Write a protein that binds this ligand. Structure first.
Ligand SMILES: Nc1nc2c(ncn2[C@@H]2O[C@H](COP(=O)(O)OP(=O)(O)OP(=O)(O)O)[C@@H](O)[C@H]2O)c(=O)[nH]1
Lengths: 363, 51, 49, 287, 350, 46, 49, 103
RNA sequence: GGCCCAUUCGGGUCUUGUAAUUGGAAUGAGUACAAUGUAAAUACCUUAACGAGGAACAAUUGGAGGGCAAGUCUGGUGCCAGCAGCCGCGGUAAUUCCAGCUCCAAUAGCGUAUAUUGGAGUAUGGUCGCAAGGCUGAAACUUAAAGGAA
């Protein structure tokens, strides 16, 4: 009897599949969308499962006929070069984001070429993955990671291509100690426009600078206009803002795209205000950057790692994150309050499981 | 044909018989000369250089 | 006993492998082969580089 | 000058690979002292002599591990390796910290000794101290010293150079002489141990006591053939073993099992340092 | 709330801009002798940080997070232990319990460099069983000894090289790479004898779930009608369809003359036309080099010596020579394969 | 068809192997020879 | 031979003509082929002149 | 070459040129070693392909100077060091089969 | 036939070669009896009896140079060149094979590493920087008047 670890619900599907892949334990995810109008897996979820089968080897993924049951027995992470065509329901970021968890621990390097819609409202954008998540991987030890935008495709027609290359095959992430709050050196950003007039980027930049002129820090937002065949099919625009710490190296980001029939200055002010909200709610990492750091301190070596998190940062998705991690890795995060009474911050201490990269060939 | 087969199998069991005689009847498994001297992989050397 | 049963299937596998080790090589595991040594039209079924 | 160049060279010798110890400084486990030899060398009498010297108690029957408070802060788990089982030799070579390697001085080296040395070398090298017995069987003193030097040189070829090959004269009253056992215990006390990679990565445990918890009524109802529930008592070595049940372990020679229950127990052979300059007779304990 | 929704929750834009018209909320944030001693200092710093955190945690949660620390006397209760262990328990034989890292539970194909031991007399044979002591486990398996044809493939070897390391592949429990191991042919005191018992030593380079090992396949043909640079070749194939799949292939002569398969002859069926760089001889043999996949046998026989009553004289799969002597069969010999003394006359020409 | 595919793949593999080996040898030569030249300049100075 | 074992320099023995092909005579190798080809090329060069 | 010492100690980082096809080339024999006292990464020669099996990753090695007497045809100039010992046992004795690696 | 010199052409010289067989003699290491020795013992001195043909009673350490395959890799202006080759096709009681390939030097000694008694011009699949490309207006538009070419 394999004695599958059983999960319920379509929540955290990618997280459960990836954590099963890293821990090597077989899982059974049951009753996903059991009573709905259209029960079963979504097409983008089946595409993600095919992506996992593509990047791994010797992994048995079983889907029931009804689609309400997934049986996953993980295998060796092998990597390699491949091309993945994302469906129209989801952008490329929905498939790129789980690969950052699996990337440094493969037998061969990830060089994956994703084709589909580049940006959307609910998922990660290219600038988001490049400048928010990859600095955290670099801090945990991934020296060489890169994401090239060959083509950029806005919704709904799509037509963009993005290339993910991870050249740092490490044994295990380093133990992390970030008790102190970082201080932000500057604010940068990218305001991009595809297949639309090139004044919208300047208009968004003026709208964002309207909000951020009060800051004493320098605000530099680059104008990225895509011309030609690289522009993709359907028209769109959008801005991504990242605030960077020069000394420590952390980065806090917000992003959005413009929907049909909206003024660019309103989008610029919205993105600037969401950036400031993330600085206010964030202590050391963003709420969107947090699962990367938590899983990395979990899979680090058997040492205590400390990462300061914020009173607002503890919330529902963090709770279900910690519960899934405790279900799979049997790891509990001890939470210690910071002795400073000025701000209610809490140190998260995680003992690493001692995970190591056994896929890499020593020779 | 079967006479040839008996001849060759007789030769083989004879060789194993001399091996079974060559192994010692004493309980103690003594070290052999190669393990004792630990000469290693050496070239052929002239007898003139011994003296 | 469970261990006794596992010993039974292990002995079964051992005896099968003994027959496989004694038995003659396949024509493709033979080093040099002619058409007389092969079965007829084998190279159409098998793929070789 | 020449002294400075020699200082640079010995500094280069003192340089070593940095590596994490993973050893508890507060309550370290006893060091596994494994007595390995050909079938007639004197392992049982050597363990008798060492236990007689350390805990002041003689043991008529020696079997399984023996835990002994050797010094103030050191305990030794003596295990006499069965001479006729290569699987036993493999398990001992994987778990042993100090290996007392018994060589019959009169007969010379044996294949069992050489096999154990090579297994230990390939898996992970423990600290090896040689003990040469049966030197009383020699008739001539010149032949005795010549065989002594021959054994020492071959032993130095096998083990690292400078490893001690202790010499035991002979049994007087069914045990080895007290001064020789005193010097041997001094050598064991002054030895220093370095952590090996496999033992620093995996948790392991040499079983001190084995017991059966299955219900005899259950046995009577379903016959003798059923699987038995088994409790195993011992000192934990290596990395910490997880507190939650379900941890997967391999028992060398039995198979793979998952831990169903685990509990800490008070120490049966505690050190006098944790109890609290010369070691006391009340402090010398045996388990 | 799903973590599939990468963008976190936010309030309305109007309320957000009304709250963030001011900026005073976040104004506070904006504004050794040797390398060896340095590494030891970093290790000691991490160890003392671990000690301080474990100290400041409560002891119950300390036990939960750390686990049972080494040097702790523990009782561990197992279920499903086999009956023969308790029945034949002998206190002299040790009991060793070692925890398994997650990789070591898995079973797959282990690739390892391996050499025949110096004091072991005979070489080892491909698909001939060997008891490996890898990790905590000892288990009998069938390895395949391979080579790289100057780093171009993994080609099967019939035997281990004497005095040399070779790549080997076997089925068993996976282990972490860079793990050393030993291999012994016999563990039975009825079989020991005077010989040195340790047969192989090695270290694990790579683990995988499959491997592609090839064995060389030479297709052998003969010339029956030879011209200048063109020959008609026989006995390589059995039909023109077989020829037509292999048309355009490199072939060569035992002399060394290179050529190409060109067309299939109509009659008789197996014959074909070939073009060479020189005139060949009726004494020549034409060879075509191809490669055939070899599958690693999946045999896992653990050494459960403690469950036995004797606790020695453990038996497993036998060596091929032992099986041949047991079933009274003769070693397979090829008359053309034997080496003979070759005498050449002086080569004259008209 | 299979013949054309095999020939193209083998040509690409051989060219990539040659490029990789030349890159390794050139980097080793440049950096290590620079260090060797600096040390020899130091020795001829002293 | 600075760093070569004497077991690396073993003699690889030459294989003979097959007994079914013994009617055709001696099995040529590269050493025989070179003599044959050199003789032909010398004859053809002087014939060309 | 090394600071004030005839020999140095290092940790083997990787073996360069094991994916090269030609046996006993200098690229086949190159090994990258990080010296203990400085952390500098230098390339050394393993004497033979036979000793390259004995050299493994993360072992401690003892490096001496290489010292070419004449310019060989296929050598790599620039590599200045050679591996003398590994794991406290000399590579020549391991190659000549007089010793086994302690690990 | 062996050897010596010499860029080659060549020249100088003369009981040499043999992994061929065979004969008895010698004795040291050792094994070991005694006495001597000394409070006693060791050791020393003396010392009967045994103690060699693979004299297996089994000397090392370094250097130089080959040669071999139905074997492998790389580059090509057929048959070549280079790097090399414990890996060949069968076979491990299986095979007696360049017979264990030849030669050199020191010898219970013998190696390694480190320390010490410029002019002129090529090559560069390394690093860094600069590039190079498109009729312009003209792109999200095949889109005007002008040109630019023609
Ligand atoms: N003469 C002499 N006999 C010794 C010496 N050492 C041990 N013995 C003999 O060894 C015998 C005891 O055997 P054991 O104590 O069991 O030795 P062992 O090697 O552990 O043997 P097993 O336990 O049976 O495997 C005694 O009767 C002694 O005669 C010694 O130094 N001199």
């Amino acid at each position: 009897a394999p004695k599958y670890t059983t999960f319920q619900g379509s929540q955290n599907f990618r997280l459960r599949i990836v954590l099963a892949t890293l821990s090597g334990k077989p899982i059974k995810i049951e009753k996903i969308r059991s009573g709905d109008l259209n029960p079963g897996l979504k097409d983008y979820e089946v595409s993600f499962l095919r992506l996992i089968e593509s990047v791994t080897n010797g992994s048995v993924i079983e889907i029931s006929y009804t689609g309400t049951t997934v049986i996953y027995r993980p295998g060796i992470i092998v990597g390699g070069a491949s091309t993945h065509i994302c469906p129209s329901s989801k952008p490329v970021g929905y498939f790129v984001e789980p690969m950052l968890y699996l990337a440094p621990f493969s037998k061969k390097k990830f060089s994956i070429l994703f084709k589909g819609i580049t940006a959307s409202h609910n998922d990660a954008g290219i600038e988001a993955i490049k400048w928010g998540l990859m600095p955290v991987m670099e801090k945990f030890g991934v020296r060489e990671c890169a994401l090239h935008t060959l083509k950029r495709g806005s919704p709904p027609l799509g037509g963009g291509e993005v290339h993910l290359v991870v050249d740092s095959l490490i044994a295990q992430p380093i133990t992390m100690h970030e008790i102190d709050r970082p201080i932000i050196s500057s604010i940068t950003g990218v305001a991009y426009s595809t297949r639309v007039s090139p004044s919208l980027v300047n208009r968004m930049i003026d709208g964002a600078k309207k909000v951020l002129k009060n800051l004493q820090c320098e605000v530099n937002i680059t104008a990225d206009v895509w011309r030609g065949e690289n522009s993709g099919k359907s028209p769109g625009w959008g801005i991504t803002l990242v605030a960077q710490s020069k000394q420590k190296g952390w980065s806090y980001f917000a992003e959005d795209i413009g929907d049909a029939g909206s003024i660019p200055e309103e989008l610029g002010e919205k993105v600037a205000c969401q950036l400031l909200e993330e600085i206010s709610k964030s202590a050391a990492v963003g709420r969107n950057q947090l699962p990367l750091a938590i899983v990395y301190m979990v899979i680090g070596k058997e040492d205590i790692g400390r990462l300061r998190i914020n009173k607002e940062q503890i919330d529902e998705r963090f709770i279900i994150l910690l519960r899934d991690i405790k279900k799979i890795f049997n790891t509990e995060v001890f939470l210690k309050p910071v002795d400073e009474a000025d701000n209610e911050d809490m140190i998260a201490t995680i003992k690493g499981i001692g995970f190591t990269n056994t896929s890499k060939k020593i020779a | 044909k079967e006479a040839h087969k008996n001849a060759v199998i007789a030769a083989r069991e004879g060789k194993l018989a001399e091996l079974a005689e060559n192994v010692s009847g004493d309980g103690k498994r003594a070290i052999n000369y190669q393990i004792l001297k630990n000469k290693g992989l050496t070239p052929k050397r002239n007898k003139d250089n011994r003296n | 006993s469970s261990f006794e049963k596992q010993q039974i299937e292990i002995r079964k596998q051992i005896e099968q492998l003994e027959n496989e080790a004694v038995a003659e090589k396949k024509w493709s595991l033979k080093g040099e082969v002619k058409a007389k040594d092969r079965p007829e039209d084998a190279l159409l079924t098998e793929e070789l580089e | 000058a020449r002294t400075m160049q020699r200082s640079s060279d010995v500094n280069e010798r003192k340089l070593h690979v940095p590596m994490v110890d993973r050893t508890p400084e507060d309550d370290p486990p006893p060091f596994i002292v494994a007595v390995v030899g050909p079938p007639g060398t004197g392992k049982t009498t050597l363990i008798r002599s060492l236990v007689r010297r350390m805990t002041k108690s003689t043991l008529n029957d020696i079997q399984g591990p023996i835990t002994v408070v050797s010094g103030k802060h050191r305990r030794l788990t003596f295990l006499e390796c069965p001479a006729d089982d290569l699987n036993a030799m493999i398990d001992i070579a994987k778990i042993a910290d100090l290996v007392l390697l018994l060589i019959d001085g009169n007969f010379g080296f044996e294949m069992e000794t050489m096999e154990f040395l090579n297994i230990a070398q390939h898996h992970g090298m423990p600290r090896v101290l040689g003990v040469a017995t049966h030197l009383d069987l020699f008739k001539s003193q010149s032949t005795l010293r010549a065989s002594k030097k021959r054994l020492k040189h071959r032993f130095w070829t096998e083990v690292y150079q400078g490893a001690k090959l202790f010499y035991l004269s002979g049994v007087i009253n069914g045990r080895y002489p007290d001064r020789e056992i005193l010097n041997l215990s001094r050598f064991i006390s002054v030895m220093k141990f370095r952590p090996l990679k496999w033992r620093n990565e995996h948790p392991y445990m040499l079983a001190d006591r084995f017991t059966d918890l299955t219900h005899p009524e259950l046995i009577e109802t379903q016959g003798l053939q059923i699987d038995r529930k088994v409790a195993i008592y011992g000192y934990l070595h290596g990395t910490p073993l997880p507190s939650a049940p379900g941890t997967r372990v391999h028992i060398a020679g039995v198979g793979d099992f998952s831990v169903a229950q685990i509990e800490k127990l008070p120490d049966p052979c505690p050190t006098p340092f944790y109890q609290q300059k010369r070691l006391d007779d009340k402090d010398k304990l045996i388990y | 709330v799903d973590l599939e929704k990468f963008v976190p929750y936010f309030d309305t834009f109007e309320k957000l801009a009304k709250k963030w018209k001011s900026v005073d909320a976040i104004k506070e944030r904006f504004l050794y002798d040797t390398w060896y001693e340095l590494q030891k200092a970093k290790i000691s710093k991490q160890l003392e940080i671990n000690n301080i955190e474990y100290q400041e945690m409560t002891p119950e949660q300390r036990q939960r997070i750390e686990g049972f620390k080494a040097g702790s006397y523990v009782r561990i209760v197992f279920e499903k232990v086999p009956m023969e262990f308790v029945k034949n328990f002998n206190p002299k034989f040790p009991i060793v319990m070692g925890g398994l890292l997650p990789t070591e539970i898995k079973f797959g194909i282990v690739k390892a460099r391996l050499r025949r031991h110096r004091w072991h007399k005979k070489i080892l044979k491909t698909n001939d069983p060997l008891v490996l002591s890898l990790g905590w486990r000892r288990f009998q398996t069938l390895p395949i000894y391979t080579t790289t044809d100057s780093r171009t493939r993994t080609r099967m070897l019939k035997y281990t090289p004497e005095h040399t390391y070779c790549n080997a592949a076997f089925y068993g429990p996976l282990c972490s790479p860079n793990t050393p191991f030993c291999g012994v042919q016999i563990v039975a005191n009825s079989d020991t004898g005077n010989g040195f018992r340790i047969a192989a030593t090695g270290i694990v380079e790579e683990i995988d779930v499959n491997i592609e090992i090839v064995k060389k396949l030479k297709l052998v043909g003969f010339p029956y009608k030879i011209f200048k640079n063109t020959a008609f070749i026989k006995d390589m194939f059995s039909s023109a369809m077989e020829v037509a799949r292999f048309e355009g292939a490199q072939i060569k002569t035992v002399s060394g003359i290179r050529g190409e398969i060109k067309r299939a002859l109509s009659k008789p069926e197996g014959h074909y036309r070939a073009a060479f760089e020189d005139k060949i001889l009726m004494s020549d043999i034409v060879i075509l080099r191809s490669w055939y996949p070899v599958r690693v046998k999946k045999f896992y026989n653990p050494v459960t010596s403690l469950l036995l009553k004797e606790k020695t004289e453990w038996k497993g799969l036998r060596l091929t020579g032992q099986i041949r002597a047991a079933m009274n069969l003769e070693t397979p010999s090829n008359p053309d394969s034997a080496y003979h003394k070759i005498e050449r006359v002086e080569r004259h020409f008209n | 068809f299979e013949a054309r595919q095999r020939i193209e793949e083998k040509n690409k593999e051989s060219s990539d192997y040659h490029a990789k080996m030349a890159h390794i040898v050139n980097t080793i030569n440049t950096e290590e020879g620079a260090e060797k030249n600096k040390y020899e300049r130091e020795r001829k100075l002293r | 031979a600075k760093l070569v074992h004497d077991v690396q320099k073993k003699q690889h023995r030459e294989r003979s003509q097959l007994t079914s092909r013994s009617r055709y005579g001696f099995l040529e190798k590269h050493k025989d082929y070179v003599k044959r080809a050199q003789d032909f090329h010398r004859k053809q060069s002087t014939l060309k002149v | 070459p090394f600071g004030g010492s005839s020999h140095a100690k290092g940790i083997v980082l990787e073996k360069l040129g094991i994916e090269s096809k030609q046996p006993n080339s200098a690229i086949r024999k190159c090994v990258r070693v990080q010296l203990i006292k400085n952390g500098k990464k230098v390339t050394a020669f393993v004497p033979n392909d036979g000793c390259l099996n004995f050299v493994d990753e993360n072992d401690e090695v003892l490096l001496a100077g290489f010292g070419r007497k004449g310019k060989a045809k296929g050598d790599i100039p620039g590599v200045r060091f050679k591996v003398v010992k590994v794991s406290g046992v000399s590579l020549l004795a391991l190659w000549k089969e007089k010793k086994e690696k302690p690990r």
